[PDB]
Design a protein around this ligand. Structure first.
Ligand SMILES: [Cl-]
Lengths: 243, 250, 195, 235, 241, 231, 111, 240, 244
């Protein structure tokens, strides 16, 4: 034993226990999700209201990369911010050299290789975040989910954090019941519902819903936050479904 | 990041042993038997092509390697460590010698340069020693034919004949009885094939044996004509057919 | 600075070096000693660009004095001159070269021989019976060629040196305000206070 | 082993807490700030009678308006003094004025936590920095290897510190004269010192606006010791 | 016992981190196979999409390294992509510097030398992957060269990698013992892919749908991966004889 | 236990012990309170002395004309972080002729604190900060933790016994938020909040430290007889 | 060849009274024979009851004034809000200017 | 580069590597310094375990730093060469810039500073060496004798000893050295130095080295026979 | 991080010893014995090759005696590979000194330089020390014939006669017994070989298990000649002295 004390050390299994311990921090965090729709993607996150003193709508968790990519994560919030800061540098240098904005699959590997790099050495710690991200590029909509190991795949729906099993079950129903596809405005409503259903795992404290989206029709392919009437409409829809 | 291992991983134990060097020699002991025999008009180096799978093409894996036109090398121990050493050995033969003096290094000096690389892995920060013992056979104008062994420590010794790896103890005893100072190259090749048969279990033929010589100049292998002083490489790898021919007279 | 001479006689080396220090228009000093003692039996005179001359001389002095302490031993004049030459030969390909010419007069206590070395700013070393830098040689060498003998006494060397200085005072346009003369022999280095 | 900059479970830096233990072993140094000046005094503590005690330099000038006393691993203080002197002179060069005592203290304290894996460990010495400036008048600071500095009306550091500090607690008031402070340092030093206090194994100094920072002669201090003995015998 | 944590020799003359990296290789539980035709080199690999939420088009362990070189990986996807990106960079630089397309075997050696460095230098860990490189080389013809975490590499007539490699290896061994040739004597790559899939079915004892496989084909001057419908067509032909 | 030797090591339950120990240093530190209305933001800090001869450790640091913070924990670390903020505020002014947004200041502190938690050799910051400011979107109050977590709040408190002041503010939320255009009443609410965290000791003239920033109010600190009004 | 300097013209005037001081300057900014601006402020209040003007090449003038104002700000931070005396300001400006000895601020500064 | 903090604090407030460097000094051969009225004498033990030595070429225990200052030591011999070299360089650098040779105090302060730097620098261990530095300041006839040690503390001494059995010779010197009247002549000072070594040395043959430093760069090392005369006279007076 | 695996080669024990230096010396105590003996008219270097084979090519072999310049040579005891690193450094230092001063390097200056390098590996860098002890045999016009030794600590000392490697305790006693100051090279040759013959762990001392060298002013007039003995010449001197 001692294989779990240092990062980048293979145990006799062939496992890197430090990465698996980073996963435990991710599992401890709040629920975040992603939904791929017809012409775009929808992100949503559970924000735990620790106290009444928290200013509503201010501690924004979802982050934009470039103008067309949305990133959300569960786990150690600073680690997620660090990863997005890198993502923005990657997306900036891509656009600088190649003119076109970074494609989503291209962007996904930039994050992937960076997170994987933090499993190669004992002088660094793995990322304590699963990141769900995506957007609209020239080849259409893309949703990705990136783990502490550097592992990522494309997704129809994605979920991570403390309510991930609850969320995943709900996402699987949507995939089955909508083979032809889901619209952007539908996905916003469903995202609101799924976060509300996934809130049963963090039921002690009440929460604040936050949603964002990229959609070719609804937002011109750009990332925008769901605000005001459209947000309240999704909250009402979500509140109706739990009761 | 940064290589934060700036300290030695090989250190002296209370008994005065350098543990990692001893363990590297243990790894060499587990490796497949290779040998070298020096004759009056040539040197022969030989080893068993231990194929990891029958689907693998063992011709692609070269255990016997040309370092310079007149110098060749064979090993026992860890193949990957040998492969990078051959790359470095070829390069150093150019950078620290040919690009200065306009000619290839003599066997002993190239050996010295290889030995230096292996010693540095025994003292430098954040590395283990190389897990190979080399046998370097070669010729140069002023020293003639020579055969050297190089160990993980970086220590090198000149030999008339020797063996390393799996069945070295038995093979060295076999060579001691057969070797004399009047051997011709063909006699040395014959003894090499006899000695190497003792350590090989399975198939024993030109496809499972690798064998090269440092002998006469090969003007057919030079690739060009018109310069009288350039007469071609003394290193020559024996073909699968050439080995089998000599196995009939065995 | 201007005029530096050197002459090796039977049992000593004599170095004559001007006293004038001119800054374009005015003569700022008429008593400047353009020499440094490197070791008890080795003296270096020098001439070249302002600042560089003294900086270089003192740098050499410090290095030889450091060697003398470390080994508890005086380097031979040949060894010191070779060290000095290398420093100048290194200097000439630098970003800003030392613009300094030197004479190294020394008495080798091992061989019991005086030795004069002339080294210019390029690192061009020559051992000589008599030497000079700059325009000094042009006036004096014809006199030295004629009168010099290898078995001369120190007193004969000084007389020949007076004749060289007199010729310089007659035919040179610059007033170099006379010379400080120093003798390097078996007993060490001393200054001829009346010249 | 473990990191040099490691936090303990209580929320303290191990190395900083251990350097504080080294300072407790050091010789006693006492500072007393008054409206007529600040007085700095130290226990020399020679390890043998053959050691020429006047060579023990535990009180040091930083500038004309700032003095400094030390306690602990006194060799560590040399680079701190050098920095303090350089900071004091450099500020005068840039601003054509004396540097504020606090600002000097802050500059010294910025070095303290520059250690890791910069230097390899914290300083093993505490400093009493005493001075005067036009803005805040006579000041006494206590600079630790944690990077923290506290201003004090009076302060004792070293092996007899907590005993001396309790004594300073009672004795200090805002209307002390310089002569009263001098005797008070000598009194408390004599109390906490192992060996009997005299002019050779204890040193005094002060900083006044007029004369600046001055280390006291052994002849001058001897008179203040004799003056102390008589005034204690007087009741 | 720190001789098992970093890449230094144990008393036995063994590198335990290298051996444990070989065990990380089978963590995906995927079996790959590579075979050579006359004009082509075919590589097939099991595709397992366990989660329904996954976009199955993005689940791939086959990579297009250069126009001519393809690579399949046995091991975790982060290390696989680490290797893939590097091999792409190396292939591109090689073409720029030396004026011709990087051969499959040279790339395999270069990647193997990199993997050797991680076995000697302590700060760098080995990648827990086995890289099987495939091409139709302009000099050597159809080529399969495989690299592991030990920094070992060798050319192959055919090969197999994964948890059930031995069953596949022996199946292939027995076929080449009959035919007595170093390749699949077949004109079209389509039939060589059919051979590959058939002999994986026989070795593993499992039937495959179009979404259970992943196929890569190397021909002269291009390497390409088959779509689900291209594989389906392949599976139809197998079933009809 | 075995996973607290450095910051680079996760525990088996996914915890960073060195960060948690740095967090502990804040709880040992003296209490400080932050609260705001729509017009003004206020810091109230209980300063701590070594003994009766010593001065009271300053708790509040000014970062710009429109921004500043109160500290709790290692004061040198607050000096480093406040100096970083001063520079970032200053860079925003010099380059963009733009006062730095309080939210963006929090984001910068978060990211600076994060790099220390992922790399080998270094250590986490051992200090908690309460940043107040007035920018283009009105009054703000942030809570910085050296884990990296920065949180915008109406009111809060950090340090020893801070839970008492934090409960009081949680009750008073609806009252003090409405104290617009009245700095003295907002300070009174802060002074009354910090009073809930006191035991044995009470607020004296050289013990209390108050700062305020607002609409037409630069960040100004009040110490000594300037805070005698509020005692 | 690129010439990094320019002449923006203008004229300034400082006069020290017994208990006061004035620093005047025209508001015209020019290049060659053209007027750039008829009102471009040249004399600036830098805080701490100090006024400053760096006349000549306006870009270097604006740069220096900007840096001194910044020096005043950091003087307050580093030294407990102490007032920067006019003599101290002057010495600080010497170091700013001399800092670019070998690529000067092409300005005549008056405070 | 190798950055590892080797010299660090322990829970009890000690830097063990500095303290273990002192243990290396305790192992080293005894060195002694005694200053008279117009001279300083540096005595040094040579352990007689090593015979068949070439005493012409073997590194002498006392080293000249400049023509007016000397340095002896106890502890690791290899380590002492590094300090001596640095000191010698600084002595010539001081002459070059200040146009005046080092004071004995200055030279000591430099060597002590170097020793200190090695106790809080990454990747390095402390010097296992204590030194005795002695000499006369330029144009000054007052004798100077200083001591340094691995920690970097230094101080001046009327007389002092370092190395193995230094406790015994310090005991001797503490009763035999009078401050009010130090050894008035060179003879008296050398005699007291030889006497103090004879408490520890074993045989008074080639095991004692003596170096006498006088004002104005007058440094001479005594020969075997000259020292042997002191050894003879001391014991003949002792037989009474 | 990396700290976990750091042996810490450059630290003091509680007793004030350098662990790695002590263990390096223990390593050297198993190496083949090398002996140096200085006479009035020259120096002798004799050294024992370690358990050789019959198939070792002895005439082209060099494990013990190396040439630094025309005036100075060294006998090695310990890791041959480590010694060769240091030997090439020393060879360069000698040529650097020659280039700078146009005079051959004095023996002690070369010895000090090498010894300072070894010292560096014990005080800083975190690397293991060189597991080598040298005997330096050399001549210069200042001190004449000189014998020195250096070891992994970087400490060096001068000698009239000295042994390094195996059985030095026994060897040094035998040398101390038969050595005299007025001795000559031919006598020193005999003493060196007699000492090895008695201290050797082998059954008998033969030509094939020895390297041998002499630095002599036995060169035509005032100059010095290094003679690295050939296998046949070592065989001849063994018969002459009466060992075989
Ligand atoms: Cl390569």
């Amino acid at each position: 034993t001692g294989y779990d004390l240092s990062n980048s050390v293979f145990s006799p299994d062939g496992r890197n226990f430090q990465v698996e311990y980073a996963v435990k921090a991710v599992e401890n965090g709040t629920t975040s999700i992603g939904i791929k729709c017809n012409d775009g993607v929808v992100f949503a996150v559970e924000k735990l209201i620790t106290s009444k003193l928290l200013v509503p709508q201010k501690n924004v968790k979802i982050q934009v990369v470039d103008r067309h990519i949305g990133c959300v994560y569960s786990g150690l919030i600073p680690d997620g911010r660090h990863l997005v800061n890198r993502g923005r540098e990657e997306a900036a240098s891509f656009k600088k050299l190649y003119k076109t904005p970074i494609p989503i699959p291209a962007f996904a590997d930039r994050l992937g290789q960076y997170v994987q790099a933090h499993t190669l050495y004992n002088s660094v710690r793995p990322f304590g975040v699963s990141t769900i991200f995506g957007g609209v590029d020239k080849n259409g909509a893309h949703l990705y989910m990136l783990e502490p190991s550097g592992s990522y795949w494309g997704y129809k729906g994605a979920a991570t954090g403390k309510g991930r099993q609850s969320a995943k079950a709900e996402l699987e129903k949507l995939v089955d019941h909508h083979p032809e596809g889901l619209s952007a405005r539908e996905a916003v409503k469903q995202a609101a519902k799924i976060i509300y259903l996934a809130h049963e795992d963090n039921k002690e404290k009440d929460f604040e819903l936050e949603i964002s989206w990229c959609s070719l029709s609804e937002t011109n392919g750009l990332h925008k936050f769901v605000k005001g009437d459209l947000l309240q409409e999704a909250i009402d829809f979500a509140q109706k479904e739990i009761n | 990041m940064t290589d934060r291992y700036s300290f030695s991983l090989t250190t002296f134990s209370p008994s005065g042993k350098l543990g990692q060097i001893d363990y590297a020699l243990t790894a060499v002991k587990q490796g497949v038997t290779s040998l070298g025999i020096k004759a009056t008009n040539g040197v022969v180096i030989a080893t068993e092509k231990k194929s990891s799978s029958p689907l693998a093409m063992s011709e692609t894996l070269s255990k016997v390697s040309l370092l310079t036109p007149d110098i060749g090398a064979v090993y026992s121990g860890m193949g990957p460590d040998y492969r990078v050493l051959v790359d470095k050995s070829r390069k150093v033969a150019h950078t620290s010698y040919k690009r200065i003096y306009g000619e290839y290094p003599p066997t002993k000096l190239l050996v010295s340069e290889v030995a230096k690389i292996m010693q540095e892995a025994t003292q430098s920060g954040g590395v283990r020693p190389f897990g190979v013992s080399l046998l370097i056979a070669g010729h140069d104008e002023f020293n003639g034919f020579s055969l050297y062994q190089v160990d993980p420590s970086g220590s090198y010794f000149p030999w008339k004949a020797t063996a390393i790896g799996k069945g070295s103890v038995a093979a060295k005893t076999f060579l001691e009885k057969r070797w004399n100072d009047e051997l011709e190259l063909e006699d040395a090749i014959h003894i090499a094939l006899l000695t190497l048969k003792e350590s090989v279990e399975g198939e024993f033929n030109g496809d499972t044996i690798e064998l090269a010589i440092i002998g006469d100049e090969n003007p057919d292998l030079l690739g060009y004509t018109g310069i009288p002083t350039d007469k071609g490489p003394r290193f020559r790898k024996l073909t699968s057919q050439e080995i089998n021919d000599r196995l009939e007279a065995l | 600075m201007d005029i530096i001479l050197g002459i090796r006689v039977q049992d000593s080396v004599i170095l004559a070096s001007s006293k004038a220090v001119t800054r374009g228009i005015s003569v700022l000093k008429d008593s400047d000693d353009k020499t440094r003692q490197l070791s008890p039996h080795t003296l270096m005179s020098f001439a070249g660009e302002a600042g560089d001359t003294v900086q270089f001389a003192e740098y050499i002095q410090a290095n030889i004095q450091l060697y003398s302490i470390r080994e508890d031993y005086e380097l031979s004049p040949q060894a010191v001159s070779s060290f000095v030459r290398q420093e100048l030969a290194k200097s000439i390909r630098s970003r800003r070269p030392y613009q300094v010419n030197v004479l190294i007069g020394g008495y080798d206590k091992k061989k019991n021989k005086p030795e004069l070395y002339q080294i210019d700013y390029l690192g061009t070393k020559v051992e000589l019976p008599y030497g000079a830098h700059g325009y000094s040689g042009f006036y004096t060498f014809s006199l030295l060629d004629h009168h010099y003998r290898p078995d001369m006494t120190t007193e004969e060397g000084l007389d020949l040196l007076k004749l060289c200085v007199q010729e310089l005072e007659k035919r040179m346009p610059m007033d170099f305000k006379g010379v400080i003369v120093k003798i390097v022999d078996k007993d060490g280095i001393r200054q001829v206070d009346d010249f | 082993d473990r990191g040099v900059s490691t936090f303990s479970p209580e929320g303290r830096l191990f190395q900083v807490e251990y350097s504080l233990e080294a300072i407790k072993l050091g010789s006693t140094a006492i500072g007393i700030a008054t409206k007529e000046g600040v007085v700095l005094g130290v226990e020399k503590r020679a390890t043998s009678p053959l050691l020429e005690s006047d060579s023990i330099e535990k009180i040091v000038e930083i500038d004309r308006h700032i003095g400094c006393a030390m306690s602990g691993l006194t060799a560590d203080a040399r680079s701190m003094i050098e920095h303090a002197r350089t900071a004091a002179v450099t500020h005068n060069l840039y601003y054509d004025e004396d540097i504020n005592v606090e600002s000097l203290t802050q500059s010294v304290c910025d070095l303290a936590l520059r250690f890791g894996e910069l230097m390899s460990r914290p300083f093993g010495v505490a400093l009493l920095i005493a001075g005067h400036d036009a803005d805040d008048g006579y000041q006494l600071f206590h600079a630790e290897p944690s990077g923290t500095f506290y201003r004090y009306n009076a302060k004792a550091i070293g092996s007899g510190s907590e005993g001396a500090q309790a004594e300073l607690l009672n004795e200090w008031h805002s209307s002390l004269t310089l002569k009263e402070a001098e005797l008070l340092v000598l009194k408390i030093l004599k109390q906490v010192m192992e060996e009997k206090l005299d002019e050779n194994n204890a040193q005094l100094s002060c900083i006044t606006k007029q004369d600046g920072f001055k280390i006291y002669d052994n002849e001058k201090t001897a008179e203040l010791i004799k003056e102390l003995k008589e005034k204690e015998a007087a009741e | 016992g720190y001789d098992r944590h970093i890449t230094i020799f144990s008393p036995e003359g063994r590198l335990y981190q290298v051996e444990y990296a070989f065990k990380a290789t089978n963590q995906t539980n995927i079996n790959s196979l590579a075979v050579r035709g006359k004009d082509c080199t075919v590589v097939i690999s099991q595709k397992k999409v366990p989660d329904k939420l996954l976009d199955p088009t993005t689940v791939s362990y086959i990579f297009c390294i250069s126009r001519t070189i393809g690579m399949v990986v046995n091991g975790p996807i982060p290390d696989a992509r680490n290797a893939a990106l590097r091999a792409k960079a190396e292939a591109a630089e090689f073409r720029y510097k030396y004026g011709y397309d990087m051969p499959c075997d040279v790339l395999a050696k270069r990647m193997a030398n990199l993997s050797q460095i991680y076995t000697q230098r302590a700060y760098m860990r080995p990648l827990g992957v086995i890289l099987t490189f495939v091409s139709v080389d302009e000099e050597l013809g159809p080529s399969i060269y495989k690299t592991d975490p030990a920094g070992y590499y060798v050319g192959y007539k055919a090969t197999a990698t994964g948890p059930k490699q031995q069953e596949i290896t022996t199946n292939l061994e027995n076929h080449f013992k009959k035919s007595k040739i170093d390749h699949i004597n077949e004109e079209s790559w389509e039939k060589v892919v059919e051979f590959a899939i058939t002999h994986m079915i026989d070795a593993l004892g499992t039937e495959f749908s179009k979404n259970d496989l992943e196929v890569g084909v190397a021909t002269k001057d291009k390497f390409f991966t088959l779509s689900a419908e291209n594989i389906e067509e392949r599976l139809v032909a197998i079933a009809e004889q | 236990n075995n996973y607290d030797g450095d910051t680079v090591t996760f525990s088996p339950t996914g915890r960073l012990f060195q960060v948690e120990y740095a967090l502990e240093a804040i709880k040992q530190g003296s209490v400080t309170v932050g609260l705001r209305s729509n017009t003004h933001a206020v810091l109230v800090a209980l300063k701590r002395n070594a003994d009766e001869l010593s001065s009271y450790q300053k708790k509040i640091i000014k970062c710009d004309e429109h921004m500043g913070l109160s500290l709790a924990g290692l004061a040198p670390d607050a000096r480093v972080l406040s100096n970083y903020l001063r520079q970032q505020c200053n860079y925003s002014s010099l380059v963009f002729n733009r006062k730095l947004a309080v939210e963006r200041a929090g984001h910068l502190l978060c990211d600076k604190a994060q790099k220390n938690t992922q790399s080998y050799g270094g250590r986490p910051y051992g200090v908690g900060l309460l940043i107040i400011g007035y920018d283009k979107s009105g009054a703000h109050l942030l809570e910085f933790q050296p884990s990296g977590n920065v949180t915008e709040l109406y009111g809060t408190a950090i340090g020893a016994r801070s839970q008492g002041a934090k409960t009081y503010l949680e009750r008073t939320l609806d009252t003090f938020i409405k104290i617009d255009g009245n700095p003295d009443e907002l300070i009174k609410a802060g002074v009354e909040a910090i009073s809930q965290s006191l035991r044995d000791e009470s607020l004296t003239v050289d013990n209390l430290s108050i700062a305020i920033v607002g609409k037409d109010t630069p960040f100004t600190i009040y110490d000594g007889e300037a805070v005698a009004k509020y005692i | 060849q690129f010439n990094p300097y320019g002449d923006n013209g203008g004229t300034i005037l400082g006069i020290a009274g017994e208990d006061f001081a004035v620093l005047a300057g025209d508001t015209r900014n020019i290049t060659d024979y053209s007027i750039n601006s008829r009102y471009e402020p040249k004399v600036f209040d830098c805080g701490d009851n100090i006024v400053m003007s760096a006349n000549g090449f306006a870009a270097d003038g604006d740069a220096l004034v900007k840096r001194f104002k910044n020096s005043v700000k950091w003087y307050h931070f580093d030294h407990n809000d102490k007032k920067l005396s006019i003599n101290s300001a002057a010495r600080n400006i010497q170091h700013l200017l001399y800092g670019k000895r070998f690529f000067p601020y092409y300005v005549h500064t008056i405070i | 580069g190798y950055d590892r903090a080797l010299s660090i604090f322990s829970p009890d407030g000690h830097i063990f590597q500095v303290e273990y460097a002192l243990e290396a000094v305790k192992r080293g051969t005894c060195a002694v310094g005694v200053k008279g009225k117009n001279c300083v004498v540096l005595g040094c033990e040579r352990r007689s375990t090593l015979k068949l030595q070439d005493t012409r070429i073997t590194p002498s225990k006392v080293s000249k730093i400049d023509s007016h200052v000397v340095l002896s030591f106890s502890g690791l011999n290899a380590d002492s060469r590094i300090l001596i070299e640095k000191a010698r360089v600084e002595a010539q650098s001081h002459r070059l810039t200040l146009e005046d040779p080092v004071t004995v105090e200055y030279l000591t302060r430099y060597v002590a500073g170097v020793q200190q730097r090695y106790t809080q620098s990454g990747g390095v261990r402390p010097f296992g060496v204590s030194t005795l530095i002695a000499g006369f300041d330029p144009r000054d006839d007052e004798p100077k004798l200083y001591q340094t040690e691995p920690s970097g503390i230094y101080s001046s001494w009327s007389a002092q000893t370092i190395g193995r059995n230094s406790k015994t010779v310090r005991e001797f010197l503490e009763k035999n050295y009078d401050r009010k009247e130090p050894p008035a002549t060179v003879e008296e000072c050398v005699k007291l130095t030889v006497r103090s070594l004879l408490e520890v040395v074993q045989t008074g043959a080639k095991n004692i080295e003596i170096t006498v430093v006088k004002p104005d760069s007058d440094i001479v090392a005594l020969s075997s026979e000259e020292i042997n005369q002191y050894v003879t006279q001391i014991e003949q007076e002792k037989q009474e | 991080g990396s700290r976990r695996y750091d042996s810490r080669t450059t630290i003091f024990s509680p007793e004030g010893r350098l662990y790695q230096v002590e263990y390096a010396l223990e390593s050297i105590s198993h190496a083949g014995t090398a002996i140096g003996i200085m006479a009035s008219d020259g120096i002798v270097l004799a050294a024992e090759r370690k358990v050789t084979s019959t198939l070792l090519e002895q005439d082209t072999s060099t494990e013990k005696l190396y040439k630094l310049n025309d005036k100075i040579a060294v006998a090695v005891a310990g890791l041959t590979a480590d010694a060769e690193i240091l030997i090439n450094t020393a060879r360069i230092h000698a040529q650097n000194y020659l280039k700078t001063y146009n005079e051959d390097i004095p023996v002690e200056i070369l010895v000090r330089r090498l010894s300072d390098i070894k010292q560096g590996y014990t005080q800083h860098g975190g690397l293991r020390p060189f597991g080598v002890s040298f005997i330096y045999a050399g001549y210069d016009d200042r001190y004449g014939y000189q014998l020195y030794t250096s070891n992994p600590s970087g400490n060096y000392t001068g000698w009239k006669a000295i042994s390094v490697g195996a059985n030095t305790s026994a060897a040094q006693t035998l040398l101390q017994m038969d050595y005299k100051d007025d001795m000559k090279v031919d006598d020193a040759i005999e003493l060196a070989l007699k000492t090895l013959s008695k201290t050797t762990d082998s059954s008998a001392l033969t030509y094939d298990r020895l390297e041998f060298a002499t630095i002599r002013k036995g060169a035509n007039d005032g100059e010095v000649y290094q003679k690295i003995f050939k296998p046949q010449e070592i065989k001849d001197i063994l018969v002459k002295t009466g060992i075989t």
